[PDB]
Amino acid sequence: IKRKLRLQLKKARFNASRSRSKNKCFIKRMENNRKIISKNNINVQVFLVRSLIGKLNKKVKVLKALGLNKIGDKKVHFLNESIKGMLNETINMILLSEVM
Amino acid sequence: MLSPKKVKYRKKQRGRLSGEAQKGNKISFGEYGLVSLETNFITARQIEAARIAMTRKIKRGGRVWIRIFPDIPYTKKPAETRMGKGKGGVDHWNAPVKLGTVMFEMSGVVEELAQEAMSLASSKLPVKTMFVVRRDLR
Amino acid sequence: GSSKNGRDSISKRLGVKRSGGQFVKAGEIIVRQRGTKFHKGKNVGLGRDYTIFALSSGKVEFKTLKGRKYVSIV
RNA sequence: GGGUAGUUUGACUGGGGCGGUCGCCUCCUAAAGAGUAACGGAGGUGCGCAAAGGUUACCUUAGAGUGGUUGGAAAUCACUCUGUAAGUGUAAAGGCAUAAGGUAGCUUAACUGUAAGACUGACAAGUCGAACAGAUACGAAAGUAGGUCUUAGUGAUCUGGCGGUGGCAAGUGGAAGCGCCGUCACUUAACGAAUAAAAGGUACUCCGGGGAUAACAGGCUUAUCCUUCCCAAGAGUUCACAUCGACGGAAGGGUUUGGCACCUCGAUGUCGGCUCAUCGCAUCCUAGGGCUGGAGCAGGUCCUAAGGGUAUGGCUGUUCGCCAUUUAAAGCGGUACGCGAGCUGGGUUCAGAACGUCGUGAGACAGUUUGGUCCCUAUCUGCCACAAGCGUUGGAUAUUUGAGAG
RNA sequence: GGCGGCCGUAACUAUAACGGUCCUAAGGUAGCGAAAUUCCUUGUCGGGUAAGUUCCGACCCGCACGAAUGGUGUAACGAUUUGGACGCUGUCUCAACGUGGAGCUCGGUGAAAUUGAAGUAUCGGUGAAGAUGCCGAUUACUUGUGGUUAGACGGAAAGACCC
RNA sequence: CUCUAGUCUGUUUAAAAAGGCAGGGAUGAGCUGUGAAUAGGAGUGAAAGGCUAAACAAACUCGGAGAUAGCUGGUUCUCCCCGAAAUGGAUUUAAGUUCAGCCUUAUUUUAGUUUAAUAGAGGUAGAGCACUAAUUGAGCUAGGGCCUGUCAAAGGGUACCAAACUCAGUUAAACUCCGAAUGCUAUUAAAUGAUGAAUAGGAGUGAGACUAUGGGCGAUAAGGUUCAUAGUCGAGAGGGAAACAACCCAGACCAACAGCUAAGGUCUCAAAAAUGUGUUAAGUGGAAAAGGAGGUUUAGGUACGUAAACAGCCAGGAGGUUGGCUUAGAAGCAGCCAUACCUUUAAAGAGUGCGUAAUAGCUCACUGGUCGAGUACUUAAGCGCCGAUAAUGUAACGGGGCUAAAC
Numbered sequence A: 001i002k003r004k005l006r007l008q009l010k011k012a013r014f015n016a017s018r019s020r021s022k023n024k025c026f027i028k029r030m031e032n033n034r035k036i037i038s039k040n041n042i043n044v045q046v047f048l049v050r051s052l053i054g055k056l057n058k059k060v061k062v063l064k065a066l067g068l069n070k071i072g073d074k075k076v077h078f079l080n081e082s083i084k085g086m087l088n089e090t091i092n093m094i095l096l097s098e099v100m
Numbered sequence B: 001m002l003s004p005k006k007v008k009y010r011k012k013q014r015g016r017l018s019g020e021a022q023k024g025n026k027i028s029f030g031e032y033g034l035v036s037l038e039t040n041f042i043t044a045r046q047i048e049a050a051r052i053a054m055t056r057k058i059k060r061g062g063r064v065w066i067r068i069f070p071d072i073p074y075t076k077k078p079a080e081t082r083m084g085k086g087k088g089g090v091d092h093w094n095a096p097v098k099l100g101t102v103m104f105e106m107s108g109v110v111e112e113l114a115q116e117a118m119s120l121a122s123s124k125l126p127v128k129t130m131f132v133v134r135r136d137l138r
Numbered sequence C: 001g002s003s004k005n006g007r008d009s010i011s012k013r014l015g016v017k018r019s020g021g022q023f024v025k026a027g028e029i030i031v032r033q034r035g036t037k038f039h040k041g042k043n044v045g046l047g048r049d050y051t052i053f054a055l056s057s058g059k060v061e062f063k064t065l066k067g068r069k070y071v072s073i074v
Numbered sequence D: 001g002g003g004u005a006g007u008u009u010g011a012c013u014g015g016g017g018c019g020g021u022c023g024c025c026u027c028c029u030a031a032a033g034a035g036u037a038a039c040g041g042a043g044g045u046g047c048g049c050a051a052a053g054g055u056u057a058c059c060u061u062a063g064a065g066u067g068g069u070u071g072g073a074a075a076u077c078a079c080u081c082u083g084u085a086a087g088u089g090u091a092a093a094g095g096c097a098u099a100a101g102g103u104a105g106c107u108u109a110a111c112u113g114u115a116a117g118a119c120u121g122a123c124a125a126g127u128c129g130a131a132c133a134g135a136u137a138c139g140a141a142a143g144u145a146g147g148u149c150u151u152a153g154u155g156a157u158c159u160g161g162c163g164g165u166g167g168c169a170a171g172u173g174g175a176a177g178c179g180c181c182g183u184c185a186c187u188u189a190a191c192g193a194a195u196a197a198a199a200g201g202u203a204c205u206c207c208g209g210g211g212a213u214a215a216c217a218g219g220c221u222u223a224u225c226c227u228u229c230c231c232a233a234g235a236g237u238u239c240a241c242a243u244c245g246a247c248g249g250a251a252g253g254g255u256u257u258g259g260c261a262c263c264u265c266g267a268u269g270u271c272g273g274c275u276c277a278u279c280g281c282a283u284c285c286u287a288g289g290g291c292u293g294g295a296g297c298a299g300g301u302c303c304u305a306a307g308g309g310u311a312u313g314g315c316u317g318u319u320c321g322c323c324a325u326u327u328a329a330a331g332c333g334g335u336a337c338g339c340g341a342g343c344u345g346g347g348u349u350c351a352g353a354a355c356g357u358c359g360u361g362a363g364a365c366a367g368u369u370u371g372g373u374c375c376c377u378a379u380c381u382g383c384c385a386c387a388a389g390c391g392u393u394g395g396a397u398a399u400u401u402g403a404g405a406g
Numbered sequence E: 001g002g003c004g005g006c007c008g009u010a011a012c013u014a015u016a017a018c019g020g021u022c023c024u025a026a027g028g029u030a031g032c033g034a035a036a037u038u039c040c041u042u043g044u045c046g047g048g049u050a051a052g053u054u055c056c057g058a059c060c061c062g063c064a065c066g067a068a069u070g071g072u073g074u075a076a077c078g079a080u081u082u083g084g085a086c087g088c089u090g091u092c093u094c095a096a097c098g099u100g101g102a103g104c105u106c107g108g109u110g111a112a113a114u115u116g117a118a119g120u121a122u123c124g125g126u127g128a129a130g131a132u133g134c135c136g137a138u139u140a141c142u143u144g145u146g147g148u149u150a151g152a153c154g155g156a157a158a159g160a161c162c163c
Numbered sequence F: 001c002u003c004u005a006g007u008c009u010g011u012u013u014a015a016a017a018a019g020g021c022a023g024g025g026a027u028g029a030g031c032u033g034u035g036a037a038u039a040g041g042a043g044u045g046a047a048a049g050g051c052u053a054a055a056c057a058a059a060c061u062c063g064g065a066g067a068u069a070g071c072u073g074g075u076u077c078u079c080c081c082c083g084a085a086a087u088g089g090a091u092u093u094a095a096g097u098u099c100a101g102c103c104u105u106a107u108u109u110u111a112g113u114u115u116a117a118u119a120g121a122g123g124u125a126g127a128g129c130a131c132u133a134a135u136u137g138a139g140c141u142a143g144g145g146c147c148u149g150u151c152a153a154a155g156g157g158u159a160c161c162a163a164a165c166u167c168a169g170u171u172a173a174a175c176u177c178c179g180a181a182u183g184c185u186a187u188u189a190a191a192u193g194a195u196g197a198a199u200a201g202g203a204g205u206g207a208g209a210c211u212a213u214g215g216g217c218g219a220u221a222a223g224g225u226u227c228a229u230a231g232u233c234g235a236g237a238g239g240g241a242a243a244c245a246a247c248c249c250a251g252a253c254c255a256a257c258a259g260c261u262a263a264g265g266u267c268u269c270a271a272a273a274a275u276g277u278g279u280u281a282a283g284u285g286g287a288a289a290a291g292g293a294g295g296u297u298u299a300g301g302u303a304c305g306u307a308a309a310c311a312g313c314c315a316g317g318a319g320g321u322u323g324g325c326u327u328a329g330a331a332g333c334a335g336c337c338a339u340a341c342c343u344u345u346a347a348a349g350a351g352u353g354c355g356u357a358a359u360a361g362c363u364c365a366c367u368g369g370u371c372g373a374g375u376a377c378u379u380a381a382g383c384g385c386c387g388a389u390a391a392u393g394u395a396a397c398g399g400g401g402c403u404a405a406a407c
Helices: A003-016 A020-037 A057-066 A081-089 B044-057 B111-122
Strands: A043-048 A074-078 A094-098 B032-036 B040-043 B063-065 B073-075 B090-097 B105-107 B129-133 C029-032 C038-040 C044-046 C052-054 C058-065 C068-073
Touching: A020 A081, A020 A094, A057 A081, B032 B111, B040 B044, B044 B063, B044 B090, B044 B111, B105 B111, B111 B129, C038 C044, C044 C068
Parallel strands: C038 C068
Antiparallel strands: A043 A074, A043 A094, B032 B105, B032 B129, B040 B090, B063 B105, B073 B090, C029 C052, C044 C052, C058 C068
C-alpha cells in the first residue's frame, strides 16, 4: 500500500479517534471560563491545566506574563481589561474559579 | 479551440484555487445552467468537447452560452529532462472554476431535452455538476 | 536551454522610519522613499531624494487632505 | 629554445562534463513595516548633457469629435467634450498641476572649510541632512542653488606619473627621495580585486576521503508505459451498445523510459546463456458458461477457473525479434530486470594493437575489430538425509486408528 | 598538413553527361567501397542453409575510403581472425558403468582466514526505506554427523568506476 | 636443448607464475657456460610505459623528516550550575575559514516581554473594472471586401470581416477607484520577576530534518527542491498511535509496594463501562475515484387519488388515411417535412416497440370495467451496495473474536 496514502490514512484515523465525552467536558469548561471572563472587577483564581510544551510562542509568552509556569499553578488576579485580554488569549489552557 | 489571442506574459504561476464562487454564480443569459460542484480547472479542449455535445444534441432549438474562457497557460517541461533550467513551456490552456460557477447556459429548448443535453455535456467535464432551472421562474 | 533571466537588485529598505505619534528630535529621518509618496507639512523638510526629515523636536503626525498624506511635526 | 625544470589551468551546478551564469539598478515571487531563497518570472546597465545644470518669470499636453489649399486614418490651424490617459535624454517602478512637463532671460552652487542629528548596516562602505564662516549666480525681496524628478552609468590596497605645499632631510648647509593636499593610469567583468606574469591529457595512473555525490539494485513518485472503466457521436441494410468504438472523462497496476538522491564507495559483483526453481492471474492450451450480425464446421466478445502442461532448430553475445518445421498450446509477469561463497565469460567495463571521426599535440569516442587470471576447506540460520539422549507417570515386545504433511 | 557547396537541365518515369553561381592555397585523379572504416542497417540483390543480424559475390545513397601516416592485388608462409565441407567422435539427445587420487571411519601429527558476545526459527508488517534480535501471529523435543550454499547486505583488498 | 599458442588442474597452491596433456623453433636474427661493460631523470629497450635484484609513468638505502594534509581515525576519573547552532555577510568560497547572530563567566546598569486603551503607515487576502491587458452574448455602427443602376464619376442590397459606443456577464504575481484580519511602531496603566542592555575573558556553530499553515519550481508527483511563521527532534527520558527520532499528551534532583488526572482507552490477550434513543446487514466498521443504483432511516417538494389513482385481469386501441411525399416500395414504424389533420370522439399518437423488399402481422401510449390506498417522479441529509484490482503466507481491525464488543 502506497506510503503517501497510508500516512494520510493513519493521521486521519488518529484525528478522528476523539471521544465525544471528552469533547463535552472541554465544552463545559470553556463555557464556564467564558461566563467568568464576562464579569468585571472581581478577584479570580487561575489554574494552569495544559502544558506549555508545543504551544505557540506568543501564547507561552502570555502565560508566563500571567505568572503560570507549570501545570498546577495557582495565581489570583484582579480582572481588569489587561487580565481579561490575557485570559481571552489563553482561555483554552486555564481553569477559572472565583475568589469570594 | 478557445484561447486568448494575445498575452502580456506567456507563463504565470500556478496559484492555489479554493473557496466557493462569489461571482458569475447566477443564470444570466439563458434558461438552464450547468453549475459545478467542485473547484478545479477546465481545459479549453474539454470545454469545446462539452460544447459540441450540447450543440449537436440540440437540433437548432436554442442557443448555448459558454461562461468560462481559459486564459491560463499550463506549462510542462520536456519529456525526459531533469529539474534544472526552469519554466518549460506552454502546453494547453486551463480555465478556473469554483463550486457554484454557472459554467454553461442554454436557451430555447424544452426542459427535458435541455436536461438530457446537459447531462451529455457533463459526461465530458472533470467536475461534478448540477443542472439547474432558474428556480425562480418555473 | 538555460534560464534567460534571474537578476535582482539589492533591497533598498524604504518605508516609514518613525511611526506617527513618536517623539523625534531635530534632523531625524522619518520616511525613505522614491517620490513624494508622503508630502511635506509643517516643520519638516524634503531631501534631494525625497527623504522626509524633522526640522525640530516634536511628535510625528500624518494628515490626509484630498487623498494625499502629509507629514508634520507637532 | 617542451631539449630540460618549476607550476598554473576558478566556482556555482537537483552527480560531473557540455551549455549558461558571476558587479550594479527596476518590478514580481515576498504571505499589506524591514528583510527573505531557487539554473523562479520580465527588463536594463559599464552612459548622456557646457545644458538636457543653477535661478527668475510665464505657459499646459495626449486622445476623441468637429470646420478646413494640396492634406489622405493621421502633419499645421480653430472650437467643444474629456482632465494627465501626454510628456519627463536612457529600463522599469514610485512620483510629477504649485507641476519635477513646455518656453525665454541672466548665469556657473557641476563652490572652499565644516557639519548637530540620523537611515541602512558583520566589517569595509554607502545615503540623507538643517545650520555656520568665506565667496558667488538669480531675484525687488523673501529665499533657492554643495549637478541632473528619484533610485543603476562602477573598482579596495599596493606601485607609479603630474601639479601644489615646504613637514621630514642619516655631522652641518643643500639636494636626491619621502610625507601632506589636488589629481591620473586596472573588462583587477571570476567586478571585497589569491601573482607584475599561467593552457591541456591520463584507460599507465597514485594517495587522502565521500553514499556530503553519480553508474547496478532497494525505497518514494507515476509524467511516460501497461491494464481497465465512465460518456456514446457514429460505423454496422434500418439497429449506440453482436462487434469496433473516435472526441473527451475517472482510476488502478509498479513491468518500460524517467524524476528524487533515503540505505550501501575501510566494495550490495553488472548483461545473457546453463542448472534449479517458487509464486501472482491481467488464462496460451485443456475445463465450465452468457451473448452473437452463432445454420453446421470454425470463430468473435465477455465471465468463472492457476490442477497440470506450455517445442526443437537457423541468424545474432544477445533478452527481444524474424524465419524453418512442429504442437492441444508454444502464456504474460514478480522474486537484487530470481539464481556467478552453483557454472560459463560471448557482451559490457583495465593495461596490447588496428580502422573511421575529433584534437597542432598528449589523447578522446553509449563508433567498430581482435587478444585478454571469474578466489574462498560452511561457524550460524535455512534446506536435503541419518543417528545419539530422554520423555510419553510400572517397565518392555509385536500389530495398528489416525490429527497433520508430502 | 589540406583536397568545397547550392541550383537548373533529355522523344514516359527516373536520374544528370551538361550549364550557371559563391568561395578557397587547391577542392579527391587512379583504384577501392555497408570495408579491421556504413550511424540510419538485419541497406538492396544474388549464392550457400528446410530456416543465415555472421560469411562470399555485387550495387553506390562513401554519416565519416583513398594513393609512401602508402592505394589496389599477390605465389608461398601463419600455435592469428572469419565462414563452409568431408571424416571422426559422450559436444549433445541422455546419461550409464568401471578405474586412480581425495572425500567417509579409526589411530598419530595438526593449521587457516575469521570472530562485540549468542538459552541466532518463519510469515505479514515496522524501521536509516531488503530484520535471527522490534510488533502481531504461526511453527518448533535436547544434541550431533554426512551433505547443499538461500541468507547472515558472508570472508578477502581504508572501491580501481564516479565525485 | 631451448621457448609457451590452445586447454585442464592449481587458485588460505607442491610452486610469491608451476604441473599434466600438448605446441613452436631446432645449421641459426640459434641455445648456453665463465668473466667483463653501461646506474635513477639515468641505463637498456627487434618498442610492451617492458626491464634494471619477486615492487618501476622515474629503483633501493640513509639523511632533510616528527615533510605537509581544509581529509579520515583516536583522545583515559567524578559531581554541581547554565546552555546552543546548522542562519545572515564575505571568500580561488560551497565538506574550510572569518565577522555578526545564538551560549557562558565576571562587573555595572535597569527595562525586555505580553496584554488592554488611544493614535499611526500599508496594499496582502478578498473584491472590483475606475487604469493597463484578456474576454462572453445581444444592441448599434464606422471602416474593409461581397452583391447590385457597376467603368474607376456620385452610387445602392449588406449573410459577413468588424473599430468605437451602449446594456448585461467574466479574468489577472508583474491590473487597482477600493480594502481587511493578524503582524509592525509610539505612549500610558497593570501583570510577569532578572527573561533586557553595556564592558571584558572563553567559545562552539555556519551539512539540518519532519509536522501544521502561506508560497515558488515540479506534473496543485515525490520521505522532491527552495523560502516565510510556529512547534518538535536535533540535544528529550515517560504514556498513547500494534512495532514506528519530527505526530498526540507531557519536561526525568533522588527515594516510597500512596492518591488525582492528560493524551489514549474501558469483551478478551490487557490495567479500565454500564445505561437511554436511533441507525447499519455490508463484518460496513476494519483503504479510495468518475459512474451506476426499486438498499434503508428521517425530512420536504411536484404529479395523482375513495367523485376510484397506479400494477394485474377483461375490452377497444379506429374512420378519413398508402398523411403528402423522397424512393422502386415507405401502407404508423429506410429517410425529408408537421402531427395549427380533422371527425366517430369514451379513446386512438402523421403511432411505443417487435417484424415484414413494400405492406401484411403482433403490441403500446390512449380510454372503458374487476379490484381497492397510497402510488409515480424527484430533493436534502444519516448509514450502506457495486465499481475494488498482484506476485514467500490469512496479511487494508495488532490478534482472538464481536450484529455490538459497530456508528
